[PDB]
Curated annotation (Swiss-Prot), chain A:
Disease connection: Microcephaly and chorioretinopathy, autosomal recessive, 1: A syndrome characterized by microcephaly, cognitive impairment, underdeveloped retina and choroid, and epilepsy in some patients. The more anterior parts of the retina, near the periphery and pars plana, have a grayish hue and diminutive vasculature similar to retinopathy of prematurity. Visual impairment becomes evident during the first year of life.
Subunit structure: Component of the gamma-tubulin ring complex (gTuRC) consisting of TUBGCP2, TUBGCP3, TUBGCP4, TUBGCP5 and TUBGCP6 and gamma-tubulin TUBG1 or TUBG2. TUBGCP2, TUBGCP3, TUBGCP4, TUBGCP5 and TUBGCP6 assemble in a 5:5:2:1:1 stoichiometry; each is associated with a gamma-tubulin, thereby arranging 14 gamma-tubulins in a helical manner. Gamma-tubulin at the first position is blocked by TUBGCP3 at the last position, allowing 13 protafilaments to grow into a microtubule.
Whole-protein coverage range: 1438 to 1532 of 1819
Gene symbol of the encoding locus: TUBGCP6
Protein name according to UniProt: Gamma-tubulin complex component 6
Functional summary from the UniProt entry: Component of the gamma-tubulin ring complex (gTuRC) which mediates microtubule nucleation. The gTuRC regulates the minus-end nucleation of alpha-beta tubulin heterodimers that grow into microtubule protafilaments, a critical step in centrosome duplication and spindle formation.
Curated annotation (Swiss-Prot), chain B:
Similarity comment text for this entry: Belongs to the TUBGCP family.
Described purpose of this protein according to its UniProt entry: Component of the gamma-tubulin ring complex (gTuRC) which mediates microtubule nucleation. The gTuRC regulates the minus-end nucleation of alpha-beta tubulin heterodimers that grow into microtubule protafilaments, a critical step in centrosome duplication and spindle formation.
Shown stretch of the complete protein: 97 to 286 of 667
GO cellular component, one term: gamma-tubulin complex
GO biological process: cytoplasmic microtubule organization; meiotic cell cycle; microtubule nucleation; mitotic cell cycle; protein-containing complex assembly; spindle assembly
Assembly: Component of the gamma-tubulin ring complex (gTuRC) consisting of TUBGCP2, TUBGCP3, TUBGCP4, TUBGCP5 and TUBGCP6 and gamma-tubulin TUBG1 or TUBG2. TUBGCP2, TUBGCP3, TUBGCP4, TUBGCP5 and TUBGCP6 assemble in a 5:5:2:1:1 stoichiometry; each is associated with a gamma-tubulin, thereby arranging 14 gamma-tubulins in a helical manner. Gamma-tubulin at the first position is blocked by TUBGCP3 at the last position, allowing 13 protafilaments to grow into a microtubule.
Location within or outside the cell: Cytoplasm, Cytoskeleton, Microtubule organizing center, Centrosome
Endpoints of the signal sequence: none
Disease: Microcephaly and chorioretinopathy, autosomal recessive, 3: A disorder characterized by congenital microcephaly and chorioretinal dysplasia associated with poor vision and nystagmus. Variable ocular anomalies include microphthalmia, retinal folding, retinal detachment, optic nerve hypoplasia, absence of retinal vessels, round areas of chorioretinal atrophy, and attenuated electroretinogram. Most patients have mild developmental delay and mild learning difficulties.
UniProt protein name: Gamma-tubulin complex component 4
GO MF, one example: gamma-tubulin binding
Keywords: Cytoplasm, Cytoskeleton, Intellectual disability, Microtubule, Primary microcephaly
Superkingdom of source: Eukaryota
Amino acid sequence: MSEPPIAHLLRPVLPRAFAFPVDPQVQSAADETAVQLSELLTLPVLMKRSITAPLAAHISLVNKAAVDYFFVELHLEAHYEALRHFLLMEDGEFA
Amino acid sequence: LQPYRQALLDLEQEFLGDPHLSISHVNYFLDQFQLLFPSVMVVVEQIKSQKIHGCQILETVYKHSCGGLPPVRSALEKILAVCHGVMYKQLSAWMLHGLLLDQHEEFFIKSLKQFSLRVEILPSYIPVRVAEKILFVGESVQMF
C-alpha cells in the first residue's frame, strides 16, 4: 500500500521513459525521409498523426504522478473513510 | 500529348537549319500523330456524353485498350496507369487505416453500415470475389 510514493526510483523511470520515445523518434525522422520519398506520402495524408503520437508519453507520466500526490501524499482515502465514518455514521459508537 | 509538342519544336530547328522546306515535309513528320489524335478523341467524347462518373472512367478507357492500332494501345495504357494510381491511392487507406476518403466519387465501397460494395461502379476487370476480400479487410480494421 505504501510502495507507490518511492520518489527516488520515480526519477530513474523518467530518463529511461523519455529515452524510450527517442528510439521511435530516431527511426521516425529517417523513415519520414523514406515516407516523404515514397509517392510524396506512401501512407494517407492522415498518417501524419504518427509524428504527434509521442505526446501520450508525457500524458501518462502526468496522470500517474497526480494520483500519488492526490492519494498517498494527501492520504485522500482517509478523508473519504472519516467522512463515511462520521457523516454517514459508519462508526457505531459515534452515531 | 507531350511527344507532339517535342516534334513541333524539332521541326522549327530544321526550318532554322534550312530556309525552304515544303509543307509535304511537314506532312511526313507529323503524320504518325494524324492517326493517334482522332482515336483519343472518342475516349474523352464518351466520358462527357454519358456523364461517366468516378471509377466508371477506369473501364471506359480499358474497353478502348483493345484498340487495333498498336500506337493507340500503348498511348491509352499510359493513362490507365496514371488513373489506377489514385484508385490504388484510395484503396491504400480503407484497406490500411480503415477510413474511406471520398467526396461524391467512389472506390467501389460505399459502422457495419454505410460500408458496402457499389456493383454498378466496380470496374469489370477487377473480379467481384477480390473486392469481397477488400471489403472484409476494411470492415475488419474499422471494427477493432
